[PDB]
Amino acid sequence: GAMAPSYRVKRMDIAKNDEECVVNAANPRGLPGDGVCKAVYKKWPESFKNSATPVGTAKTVMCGTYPVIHAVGPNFSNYTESEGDRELAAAYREVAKEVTRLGVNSVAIPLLSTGVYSGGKDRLTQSLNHLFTAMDSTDADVVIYCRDKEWEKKISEAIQMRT
Ligand SMILES: [Cl-]
Ligand SMILES: [Cl-]
Ligand SMILES: [Cl-]
């Protein structure tokens, strides 16, 4: 565990993280994909061997000794708000199980279902709150990665709010 488990937010490419493992915002088929998933494919392509896994689940594949946790959030274009919300919560619960099993002291994590899978909605609060529900009982340092300057400010405020 980390000595004083924390949350932090950084605005940069998650492929350049300084943590002990990475969460991929994966597709169910283990394809290179776009956005975070394509950056992850360019950096850790070996981790896409047998990475396909259903919506609402996470599957870890090692690139050398570096763990890539493939977490599949729902595409809100296809799911109802209700079912999508349930699957998005479940994907983060499976990330917390994997982070714990791996015994890492730190993890780099993107906000699942906030990009191409958002069904054109702002899901910062929805996705971040499910991230906190899952990760709060873990003792890894969590570093959230984002690309937008206004999202960085809002994620930083949400972290500081809880103190
Ligand atoms: Cl960058
Ligand atoms: Cl997405
Ligand atoms: Cl972002």
Side-chain angles (χ1 to χ4, degrees):
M3 278 307 103
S6 65
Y7 289 106
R8 299 166 56 228
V9 59
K10 297 208 284 176
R11 183 185 82 98
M12 55 182 282
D13 187 356
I14 198 170
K16 302 175 179 187
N17 77 77
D18 191 32
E19 290 68 59
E20 290 185 358
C21 68
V22 70
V23 175
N24 183 29
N27 60 72
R29 306 181 178 270
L31 293 161
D34 304 77
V36 164
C37 190
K38 174 54 58 55
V40 168
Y41 183 72
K42 291 192 183 136
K43 184 56 68 179
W44 304 285
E46 298 88 344
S47 74
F48 287 72
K49 193 171 181 267
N50 293 308
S51 63
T53 195
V55 174
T57 77
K59 186 166 188 181
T60 303
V61 183
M62 306 301 293
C63 175
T65 71
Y66 188 78
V68 176
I69 304 168
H70 299 274
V72 184
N75 176 4
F76 278 100
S77 289
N78 296 334
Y79 285 88
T80 65
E81 289 292 339
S82 176
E83 202 71 357
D85 183 69
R86 189 181 62 68
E87 288 299 1
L88 177 55
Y92 281 116
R93 292 187 304 270
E94 299 302 304
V95 165
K97 294 178 189 173
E98 285 297 279
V99 166
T100 298
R101 181 184 65 75
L102 288 165
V104 294
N105 292 336
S106 64
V107 55
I109 194 167
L111 293 190
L112 301 176
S113 297
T114 63
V116 295
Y117 280 11
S118 68
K121 293 201 175 171
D122 169 354
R123 296 187 185 273
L124 189 173
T125 299
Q126 173 180 26
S127 186
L128 183 61
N129 280 340
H130 285 326
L131 185 163
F132 287 151
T133 298
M135 301 304 294
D136 277 350
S137 64
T138 73
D139 60 5
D141 283 338
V142 170
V143 182
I144 300 164
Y145 286 74
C146 70
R147 293 313 289 273
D148 180 276
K149 284 175 177 192
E150 297 308 306
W151 281 41
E152 184 190 7
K153 289 182 189 148
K154 281 179 279 192
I155 300 163
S156 185
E157 289 159 351
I159 294 167
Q160 292 324 131
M161 282 314 289
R162 337 169 78 209
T163 282

Short mmCIF file of all heavy atoms in Angstrom, two decimals, residues 93-147:
data_model
loop_
_atom_site.label_atom_id
_atom_site.label_comp_id
_atom_site.label_asym_id
_atom_site.label_seq_id
_atom_site.Cartn_x
_atom_site.Cartn_y
_atom_site.Cartn_z
N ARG A 93 -15.56 -1.20 -10.24
CA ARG A 93 -15.41 -2.23 -9.17
C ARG A 93 -14.39 -3.30 -9.61
O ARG A 93 -13.62 -3.77 -8.76
CB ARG A 93 -16.71 -2.91 -8.74
CG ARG A 93 -17.69 -2.00 -8.02
CD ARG A 93 -18.91 -2.74 -7.45
NE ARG A 93 -19.70 -3.52 -8.40
CZ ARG A 93 -20.74 -3.02 -9.07
NH1 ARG A 93 -21.08 -1.75 -8.92
NH2 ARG A 93 -21.42 -3.78 -9.91
N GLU A 94 -14.42 -3.76 -10.87
CA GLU A 94 -13.46 -4.79 -11.34
C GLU A 94 -12.05 -4.18 -11.39
O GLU A 94 -11.10 -4.90 -11.07
CB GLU A 94 -13.93 -5.40 -12.68
CG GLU A 94 -15.28 -6.09 -12.57
CD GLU A 94 -15.32 -7.21 -11.55
OE1 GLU A 94 -14.47 -8.13 -11.68
OE2 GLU A 94 -16.15 -7.13 -10.61
N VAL A 95 -11.88 -2.90 -11.70
CA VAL A 95 -10.55 -2.25 -11.65
C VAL A 95 -10.04 -2.32 -10.20
O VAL A 95 -8.85 -2.67 -10.01
CB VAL A 95 -10.57 -0.81 -12.19
CG1 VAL A 95 -9.32 -0.01 -11.82
CG2 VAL A 95 -10.79 -0.83 -13.68
N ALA A 96 -10.86 -1.98 -9.23
CA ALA A 96 -10.39 -2.01 -7.81
C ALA A 96 -9.92 -3.42 -7.42
O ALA A 96 -8.88 -3.53 -6.73
CB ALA A 96 -11.47 -1.55 -6.87
N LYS A 97 -10.63 -4.47 -7.82
CA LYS A 97 -10.25 -5.88 -7.56
C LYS A 97 -8.87 -6.15 -8.17
O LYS A 97 -7.99 -6.72 -7.50
CB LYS A 97 -11.28 -6.87 -8.07
CG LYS A 97 -12.62 -6.83 -7.37
CD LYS A 97 -13.66 -7.82 -7.95
CE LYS A 97 -15.04 -7.58 -7.36
NZ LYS A 97 -16.06 -8.42 -8.03
N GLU A 98 -8.65 -5.76 -9.43
CA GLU A 98 -7.37 -6.02 -10.10
C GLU A 98 -6.22 -5.27 -9.43
O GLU A 98 -5.15 -5.83 -9.28
CB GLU A 98 -7.54 -5.71 -11.60
CG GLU A 98 -8.31 -6.80 -12.30
CD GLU A 98 -7.62 -8.16 -12.28
OE1 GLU A 98 -6.74 -8.35 -13.11
OE2 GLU A 98 -7.86 -9.01 -11.35
N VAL A 99 -6.41 -3.99 -9.15
CA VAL A 99 -5.38 -3.14 -8.51
C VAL A 99 -4.99 -3.83 -7.19
O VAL A 99 -3.79 -3.96 -6.89
CB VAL A 99 -5.92 -1.71 -8.28
CG1 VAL A 99 -4.99 -0.94 -7.33
CG2 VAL A 99 -6.04 -0.94 -9.61
N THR A 100 -6.00 -4.30 -6.46
CA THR A 100 -5.71 -4.96 -5.14
C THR A 100 -4.92 -6.25 -5.36
O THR A 100 -3.87 -6.45 -4.65
CB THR A 100 -7.00 -5.25 -4.38
OG1 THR A 100 -7.65 -3.98 -4.12
CG2 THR A 100 -6.71 -6.00 -3.10
N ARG A 101 -5.38 -7.11 -6.27
CA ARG A 101 -4.75 -8.42 -6.57
C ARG A 101 -3.28 -8.21 -6.97
O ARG A 101 -2.42 -9.04 -6.59
CB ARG A 101 -5.53 -9.16 -7.66
CG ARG A 101 -4.95 -10.55 -7.99
CD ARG A 101 -5.67 -11.27 -9.15
NE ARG A 101 -5.50 -10.56 -10.41
CZ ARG A 101 -4.40 -10.55 -11.15
NH1 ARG A 101 -3.31 -11.20 -10.76
NH2 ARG A 101 -4.37 -9.84 -12.25
N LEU A 102 -2.95 -7.17 -7.74
CA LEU A 102 -1.62 -6.95 -8.31
C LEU A 102 -0.65 -6.49 -7.20
O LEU A 102 0.56 -6.60 -7.41
CB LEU A 102 -1.67 -5.92 -9.44
CG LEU A 102 -2.32 -6.41 -10.73
CD1 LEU A 102 -2.65 -5.21 -11.61
CD2 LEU A 102 -1.39 -7.37 -11.45
N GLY A 103 -1.16 -5.91 -6.12
CA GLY A 103 -0.33 -5.44 -4.98
C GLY A 103 0.47 -4.20 -5.33
O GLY A 103 1.38 -3.86 -4.58
N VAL A 104 0.06 -3.45 -6.37
CA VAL A 104 0.72 -2.17 -6.74
C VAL A 104 0.49 -1.10 -5.65
O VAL A 104 -0.54 -1.12 -4.94
CB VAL A 104 0.22 -1.68 -8.10
CG1 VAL A 104 0.65 -2.64 -9.19
CG2 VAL A 104 -1.30 -1.48 -8.12
N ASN A 105 1.41 -0.15 -5.55
CA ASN A 105 1.26 1.02 -4.67
C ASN A 105 0.67 2.23 -5.41
O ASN A 105 0.35 3.22 -4.75
CB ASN A 105 2.57 1.37 -3.98
CG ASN A 105 2.94 0.27 -2.99
OD1 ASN A 105 2.09 -0.48 -2.50
ND2 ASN A 105 4.23 0.12 -2.77
N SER A 106 0.50 2.16 -6.74
CA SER A 106 -0.02 3.33 -7.51
C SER A 106 -0.64 2.82 -8.82
O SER A 106 -0.22 1.76 -9.28
CB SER A 106 1.00 4.39 -7.78
OG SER A 106 2.04 3.94 -8.59
N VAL A 107 -1.59 3.57 -9.35
CA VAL A 107 -2.32 3.24 -10.61
C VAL A 107 -2.68 4.54 -11.32
O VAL A 107 -3.15 5.50 -10.68
CB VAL A 107 -3.57 2.37 -10.34
CG1 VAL A 107 -4.52 3.01 -9.32
CG2 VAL A 107 -4.33 2.05 -11.61
N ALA A 108 -2.48 4.56 -12.63
CA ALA A 108 -2.89 5.63 -13.57
C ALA A 108 -4.26 5.23 -14.16
O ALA A 108 -4.37 4.10 -14.68
CB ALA A 108 -1.88 5.74 -14.69
N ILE A 109 -5.26 6.11 -14.08
CA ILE A 109 -6.66 5.75 -14.48
C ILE A 109 -7.32 6.90 -15.25
O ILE A 109 -7.38 8.03 -14.76
CB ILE A 109 -7.48 5.34 -13.26
CG1 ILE A 109 -8.79 4.65 -13.65
CG2 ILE A 109 -7.74 6.52 -12.33
CD1 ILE A 109 -9.46 3.96 -12.51
N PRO A 110 -7.92 6.59 -16.42
CA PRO A 110 -8.71 7.56 -17.16
C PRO A 110 -10.17 7.52 -16.71
O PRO A 110 -10.61 6.57 -16.03
CB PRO A 110 -8.59 7.01 -18.59
CG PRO A 110 -8.64 5.52 -18.40
CD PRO A 110 -7.94 5.26 -17.07
N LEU A 111 -10.98 8.55 -17.05
CA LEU A 111 -12.42 8.51 -16.71
C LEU A 111 -13.16 7.70 -17.79
O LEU A 111 -13.32 8.20 -18.97
CB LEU A 111 -12.98 9.92 -16.56
CG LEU A 111 -12.45 10.74 -15.38
CD1 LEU A 111 -13.28 12.02 -15.22
CD2 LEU A 111 -12.50 9.95 -14.11
N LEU A 112 -13.58 6.49 -17.44
CA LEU A 112 -14.26 5.57 -18.37
C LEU A 112 -15.55 6.21 -18.89
O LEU A 112 -16.25 6.93 -18.14
CB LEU A 112 -14.53 4.23 -17.68
CG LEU A 112 -13.31 3.49 -17.14
CD1 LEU A 112 -13.72 2.24 -16.40
CD2 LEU A 112 -12.35 3.14 -18.24
N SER A 113 -15.86 5.92 -20.16
CA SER A 113 -17.12 6.29 -20.85
C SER A 113 -17.31 7.82 -20.95
O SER A 113 -18.49 8.21 -21.07
CB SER A 113 -18.30 5.62 -20.22
OG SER A 113 -18.23 4.18 -20.33
N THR A 114 -16.25 8.63 -20.92
CA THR A 114 -16.36 10.12 -21.01
C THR A 114 -16.03 10.67 -22.41
O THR A 114 -16.25 11.88 -22.62
CB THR A 114 -15.54 10.84 -19.92
OG1 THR A 114 -14.15 10.54 -20.08
CG2 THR A 114 -16.08 10.51 -18.55
N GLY A 115 -15.46 9.85 -23.29
CA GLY A 115 -15.07 10.23 -24.67
C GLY A 115 -16.10 9.72 -25.68
O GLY A 115 -17.29 10.03 -25.54
N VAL A 116 -15.62 8.93 -26.65
CA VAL A 116 -16.42 8.33 -27.77
C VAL A 116 -17.59 7.50 -27.21
O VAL A 116 -18.63 7.41 -27.88
CB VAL A 116 -15.51 7.51 -28.70
CG1 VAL A 116 -14.48 8.38 -29.42
CG2 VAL A 116 -14.80 6.39 -27.97
N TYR A 117 -17.47 6.96 -25.99
CA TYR A 117 -18.51 6.11 -25.39
C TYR A 117 -19.51 6.93 -24.55
O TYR A 117 -20.41 6.35 -23.95
CB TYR A 117 -17.87 5.01 -24.53
CG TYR A 117 -17.33 3.80 -25.25
CD1 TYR A 117 -17.18 3.72 -26.64
CD2 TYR A 117 -17.00 2.66 -24.53
CE1 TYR A 117 -16.70 2.57 -27.26
CE2 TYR A 117 -16.50 1.52 -25.14
CZ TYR A 117 -16.35 1.46 -26.51
OH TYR A 117 -15.84 0.33 -27.13
N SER A 118 -19.43 8.28 -24.55
CA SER A 118 -20.28 9.16 -23.69
C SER A 118 -21.70 9.34 -24.26
O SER A 118 -22.57 9.85 -23.53
CB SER A 118 -19.65 10.52 -23.47
OG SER A 118 -19.62 11.27 -24.68
N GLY A 119 -21.96 8.86 -25.47
CA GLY A 119 -23.25 9.13 -26.15
C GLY A 119 -23.53 10.63 -26.23
O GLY A 119 -24.72 11.00 -26.19
N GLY A 120 -22.46 11.42 -26.36
CA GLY A 120 -22.47 12.88 -26.58
C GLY A 120 -22.81 13.74 -25.37
O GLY A 120 -23.13 14.95 -25.55
N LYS A 121 -22.75 13.16 -24.16
CA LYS A 121 -23.09 13.82 -22.88
C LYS A 121 -21.80 14.09 -22.09
O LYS A 121 -20.77 13.47 -22.39
CB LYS A 121 -24.08 12.98 -22.07
CG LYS A 121 -25.47 12.86 -22.68
CD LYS A 121 -26.55 12.49 -21.70
CE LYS A 121 -27.93 12.50 -22.32
NZ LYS A 121 -28.95 11.94 -21.40
N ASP A 122 -21.87 15.06 -21.17
CA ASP A 122 -20.79 15.34 -20.20
C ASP A 122 -21.02 14.37 -19.04
O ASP A 122 -22.03 14.46 -18.36
CB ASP A 122 -20.83 16.84 -19.85
CG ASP A 122 -19.97 17.24 -18.67
OD1 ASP A 122 -19.40 16.35 -18.01
OD2 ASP A 122 -19.84 18.46 -18.45
N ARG A 123 -20.09 13.42 -18.84
CA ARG A 123 -20.23 12.39 -17.80
C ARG A 123 -19.06 12.49 -16.81
O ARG A 123 -18.78 11.48 -16.14
CB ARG A 123 -20.32 11.01 -18.47
CG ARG A 123 -21.56 10.85 -19.35
CD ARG A 123 -21.74 9.44 -19.89
NE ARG A 123 -22.88 9.42 -20.83
CZ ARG A 123 -24.15 9.25 -20.50
NH1 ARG A 123 -24.56 9.04 -19.27
NH2 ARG A 123 -25.07 9.29 -21.47
N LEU A 124 -18.41 13.65 -16.70
CA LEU A 124 -17.28 13.84 -15.73
C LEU A 124 -17.77 13.41 -14.35
O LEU A 124 -17.14 12.51 -13.74
CB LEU A 124 -16.81 15.31 -15.75
CG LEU A 124 -15.52 15.65 -14.98
CD1 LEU A 124 -15.09 17.09 -15.24
CD2 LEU A 124 -15.64 15.43 -13.50
N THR A 125 -18.82 14.02 -13.80
CA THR A 125 -19.27 13.75 -12.41
C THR A 125 -19.69 12.29 -12.26
O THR A 125 -19.33 11.61 -11.27
CB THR A 125 -20.36 14.74 -11.99
OG1 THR A 125 -19.73 16.03 -12.07
CG2 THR A 125 -20.88 14.44 -10.61
N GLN A 126 -20.45 11.76 -13.21
CA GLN A 126 -21.00 10.37 -13.14
C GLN A 126 -19.80 9.39 -13.08
O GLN A 126 -19.78 8.46 -12.25
CB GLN A 126 -21.87 10.09 -14.36
CG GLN A 126 -22.34 8.65 -14.47
CD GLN A 126 -23.20 8.45 -15.69
OE1 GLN A 126 -23.07 9.17 -16.67
NE2 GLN A 126 -24.04 7.44 -15.58
N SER A 127 -18.85 9.57 -13.98
CA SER A 127 -17.73 8.61 -14.11
C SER A 127 -16.79 8.75 -12.90
O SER A 127 -16.37 7.67 -12.33
CB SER A 127 -17.04 8.80 -15.41
OG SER A 127 -16.04 7.81 -15.66
N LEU A 128 -16.45 9.99 -12.53
CA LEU A 128 -15.56 10.23 -11.36
C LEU A 128 -16.19 9.67 -10.09
O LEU A 128 -15.45 9.14 -9.26
CB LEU A 128 -15.27 11.74 -11.24
CG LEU A 128 -14.30 12.12 -10.11
CD1 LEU A 128 -12.92 11.48 -10.30
CD2 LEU A 128 -14.15 13.63 -10.03
N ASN A 129 -17.49 9.82 -9.86
CA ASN A 129 -18.14 9.35 -8.62
C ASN A 129 -18.09 7.83 -8.59
O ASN A 129 -17.79 7.25 -7.53
CB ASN A 129 -19.53 9.94 -8.44
CG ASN A 129 -19.45 11.35 -7.90
OD1 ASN A 129 -18.45 11.77 -7.33
ND2 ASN A 129 -20.52 12.10 -8.04
N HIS A 130 -18.27 7.15 -9.73
CA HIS A 130 -18.13 5.68 -9.74
C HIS A 130 -16.67 5.27 -9.49
O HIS A 130 -16.44 4.20 -8.86
CB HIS A 130 -18.68 5.15 -11.06
CG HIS A 130 -20.16 5.15 -11.15
ND1 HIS A 130 -21.01 4.92 -10.07
CD2 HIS A 130 -20.96 5.33 -12.23
CE1 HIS A 130 -22.27 4.91 -10.50
NE2 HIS A 130 -22.26 5.21 -11.81
N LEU A 131 -15.72 6.04 -9.99
CA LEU A 131 -14.28 5.80 -9.74
C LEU A 131 -14.05 5.87 -8.22
O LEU A 131 -13.50 4.94 -7.63
CB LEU A 131 -13.44 6.80 -10.54
CG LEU A 131 -11.92 6.63 -10.52
CD1 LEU A 131 -11.30 7.40 -11.64
CD2 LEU A 131 -11.28 7.06 -9.19
N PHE A 132 -14.50 6.94 -7.59
CA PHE A 132 -14.31 7.08 -6.12
C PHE A 132 -14.99 5.92 -5.38
O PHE A 132 -14.40 5.39 -4.40
CB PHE A 132 -14.88 8.42 -5.63
CG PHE A 132 -14.11 9.66 -5.98
CD1 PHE A 132 -14.80 10.86 -6.14
CD2 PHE A 132 -12.74 9.67 -6.15
CE1 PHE A 132 -14.12 12.02 -6.41
CE2 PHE A 132 -12.05 10.85 -6.43
CZ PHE A 132 -12.75 12.03 -6.57
N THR A 133 -16.24 5.54 -5.70
CA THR A 133 -16.96 4.47 -4.99
C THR A 133 -16.12 3.18 -4.97
O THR A 133 -16.05 2.47 -3.93
CB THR A 133 -18.34 4.26 -5.60
OG1 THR A 133 -19.03 5.50 -5.42
CG2 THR A 133 -19.07 3.10 -4.98
N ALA A 134 -15.48 2.86 -6.10
CA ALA A 134 -14.69 1.63 -6.25
C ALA A 134 -13.35 1.77 -5.54
O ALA A 134 -12.91 0.75 -4.90
CB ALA A 134 -14.46 1.35 -7.74
N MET A 135 -12.65 2.88 -5.75
CA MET A 135 -11.23 3.00 -5.38
C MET A 135 -11.05 3.45 -3.92
O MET A 135 -9.94 3.33 -3.41
CB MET A 135 -10.44 3.89 -6.34
CG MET A 135 -10.47 3.43 -7.80
SD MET A 135 -9.91 1.74 -8.08
CE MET A 135 -8.19 1.91 -7.63
N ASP A 136 -12.08 3.98 -3.29
CA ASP A 136 -11.91 4.56 -1.93
C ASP A 136 -11.44 3.50 -0.95
O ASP A 136 -10.71 3.87 -0.03
CB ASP A 136 -13.19 5.18 -1.43
CG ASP A 136 -13.46 6.59 -1.90
OD1 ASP A 136 -12.58 7.23 -2.51
OD2 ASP A 136 -14.59 7.07 -1.61
N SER A 137 -11.81 2.23 -1.10
CA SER A 137 -11.43 1.17 -0.15
C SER A 137 -10.07 0.57 -0.51
O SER A 137 -9.57 -0.30 0.26
CB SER A 137 -12.51 0.11 -0.04
OG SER A 137 -12.68 -0.57 -1.30
N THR A 138 -9.43 1.01 -1.61
CA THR A 138 -8.08 0.54 -1.96
C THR A 138 -7.03 1.47 -1.32
O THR A 138 -7.35 2.68 -1.05
CB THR A 138 -7.84 0.44 -3.47
OG1 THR A 138 -7.73 1.77 -4.03
CG2 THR A 138 -8.91 -0.38 -4.15
N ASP A 139 -5.79 0.99 -1.14
CA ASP A 139 -4.72 1.84 -0.57
C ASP A 139 -3.65 2.18 -1.61
O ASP A 139 -2.60 2.70 -1.24
CB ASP A 139 -4.06 1.18 0.65
CG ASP A 139 -3.41 -0.17 0.41
OD1 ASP A 139 -3.34 -0.63 -0.76
OD2 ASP A 139 -2.97 -0.82 1.43
N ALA A 140 -3.94 2.04 -2.91
CA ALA A 140 -3.02 2.54 -3.96
C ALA A 140 -3.13 4.07 -4.10
O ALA A 140 -4.27 4.61 -4.02
CB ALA A 140 -3.32 1.80 -5.25
N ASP A 141 -2.03 4.77 -4.38
CA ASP A 141 -2.08 6.16 -4.89
C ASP A 141 -2.79 6.12 -6.26
O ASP A 141 -2.39 5.29 -7.11
CB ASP A 141 -0.71 6.83 -4.96
CG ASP A 141 -0.16 7.30 -3.62
OD1 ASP A 141 -0.97 7.50 -2.69
OD2 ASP A 141 1.06 7.40 -3.51
N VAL A 142 -3.87 6.89 -6.43
CA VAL A 142 -4.61 6.93 -7.71
C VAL A 142 -4.28 8.24 -8.40
O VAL A 142 -4.33 9.33 -7.76
CB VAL A 142 -6.11 6.78 -7.46
CG1 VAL A 142 -6.87 7.05 -8.75
CG2 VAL A 142 -6.48 5.44 -6.89
N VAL A 143 -3.85 8.18 -9.64
CA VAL A 143 -3.58 9.39 -10.45
C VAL A 143 -4.49 9.35 -11.67
O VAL A 143 -4.39 8.44 -12.47
CB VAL A 143 -2.12 9.51 -10.87
CG1 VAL A 143 -1.87 10.78 -11.66
CG2 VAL A 143 -1.20 9.43 -9.66
N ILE A 144 -5.42 10.28 -11.72
CA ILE A 144 -6.44 10.36 -12.79
C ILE A 144 -5.83 11.19 -13.91
O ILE A 144 -5.30 12.30 -13.64
CB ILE A 144 -7.75 10.96 -12.22
CG1 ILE A 144 -8.31 10.12 -11.08
CG2 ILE A 144 -8.77 11.18 -13.34
CD1 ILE A 144 -9.37 10.85 -10.25
N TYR A 145 -5.96 10.73 -15.15
CA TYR A 145 -5.40 11.41 -16.36
C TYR A 145 -6.57 11.96 -17.18
O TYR A 145 -7.57 11.28 -17.38
CB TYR A 145 -4.50 10.48 -17.16
CG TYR A 145 -3.16 10.27 -16.49
CD1 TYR A 145 -3.05 9.47 -15.36
CD2 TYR A 145 -2.03 10.94 -16.91
CE1 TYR A 145 -1.84 9.31 -14.74
CE2 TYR A 145 -0.81 10.80 -16.27
CZ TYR A 145 -0.70 9.97 -15.17
OH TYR A 145 0.49 9.89 -14.52
N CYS A 146 -6.43 13.19 -17.65
CA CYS A 146 -7.43 13.87 -18.50
C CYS A 146 -6.69 14.72 -19.54
O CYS A 146 -5.43 14.80 -19.47
CB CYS A 146 -8.41 14.69 -17.66
SG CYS A 146 -7.64 16.16 -16.89
N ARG A 147 -7.40 15.26 -20.54
CA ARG A 147 -6.75 16.04 -21.63
C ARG A 147 -7.25 17.50 -21.65
O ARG A 147 -6.48 18.36 -22.14
CB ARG A 147 -6.91 15.33 -22.98
CG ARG A 147 -6.14 14.01 -23.07
CD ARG A 147 -4.67 13.96 -22.62
NE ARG A 147 -3.70 14.65 -23.46
CZ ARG A 147 -3.08 14.12 -24.52
NH1 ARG A 147 -3.34 12.88 -24.90
NH2 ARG A 147 -2.21 14.84 -25.21
#
